[PDB]
Amino acid sequence: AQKSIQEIQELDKDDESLRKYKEALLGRVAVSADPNVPNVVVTGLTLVCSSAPGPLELDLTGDLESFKKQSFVLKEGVEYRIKISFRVNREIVSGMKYIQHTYRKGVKIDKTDYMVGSYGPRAEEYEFLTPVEEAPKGMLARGSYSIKSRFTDDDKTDHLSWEWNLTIKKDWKD
Amino acid sequence: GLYSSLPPAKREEVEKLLNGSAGDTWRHLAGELGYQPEHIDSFTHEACPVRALLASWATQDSATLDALLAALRRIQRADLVESLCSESTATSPV
């Protein structure tokens, strides 16, 4: 019939209302797999500091020009570590290297590069932690240090590069 | 100038750099802002009260940059002030 079996076929209306939520998927067919997005990017940087009261972090993949002004908080003569977090949603990459420079009052003094290795196209993000690093000291050396950070590979492909400031404060914990 | 005049990334950095500063740096700021002592005992109980403090302060016109800077000078944080003032000033050479 046309108007007798609908008394039990009503369950279809309870799952047909959910078809409108499937329609929203058509609004965002990018899947982060289009050529308009890069292969590997640092999702953020984190500063693990066992001497500090709490962990530090900074967001990335955005307005890297802003980080040339904003700074971090460290302590004079303290020990710290740098953790870099990056996602890989494209292909395997090898010979990956993280470069870290240090500029005092607008003058580079040295730089160090840390090999991260090779990583595959995992839907998640990988993290790399540096060894112990010391901080400068004296009230004149409490100024903002520019750090330049770069990521490259054995294929000479720059993934991202940024730069961020660092306030060396006298206290950070009491 | 108002704290609302700063870029979104500044407002995030004010929180993210203060997590490395003393666990009670915000406690000094709140005392000089004229916040009541009972509100300080409610904030120190939270995990990240420094983030909520900026949002609760930004609820009112008193949240000017000039007022925030003035209060940071009273608590001997002129060090941290000068470094955040790198964006909080008229500068754009491009």
Residue A111, token pair as written in the block: 């730089």
Query: Quick one: CA dihedral B20, B21, B23, B26, positive or negative?
Result: negative
Give one DSSP letter per residue of A59-122, joined into a string.
E-SS-TTGGGT-EEEEETT-EEEEEEEEEE-S--EEEEEEEEEEEETTEEEEEEEEEEEEE---
Count of Cβ atoms closer than 10 Å to residue A65 Cβ: 13
Method: NMR
Domain-wise residue ranges, chain B: 1-94
**B29/B50 Cα distance (integer angstroms):** 10
Assigned CATH class of A36-174 = mainly beta
CB-CB under 8 Å, A58 with B16? yes
Q: Please report, as a single letter, which amino acid is at residue A153.
A: D
DSSP collapsed to 3 states, chain B: CEHHHCCHHHHHHHHHHHCCCCCCHHHHHHHHCCCCHHHHHHHHCCCCHHHHHHHHHCCCCCCEHHHHHHHHHHCCCHHHHHHHCCCCCCCCCC
Q: Closest Cα of chain B to A128: distance in Å? A: 20
> Considering only CB atoms, which chain B residues are within 8 Å of A173?
22-23
Q: Closest Cα of chain B to A2: distance in Å? A: 59
**B78/B94 Cα distance (integer angstroms):** 28
CA A13-A14-A20 angle, to 5 degrees, is: 85
Scored b (16 or more CB within 10 A) or e, B59-70 reads eeeebebeebbe
CATH architecture of the domain with residue range B1-94: Orthogonal Bundle (1.10)
CB-CB under 8 Å, A59 with B12? yes
Q: State whether residue A150 is helix, strand or coil.
A: strand
Ramachandran angles phi, psi of B71, nearest 5°: -65, -40
**B51/A67 Cα distance (integer angstroms):** 19
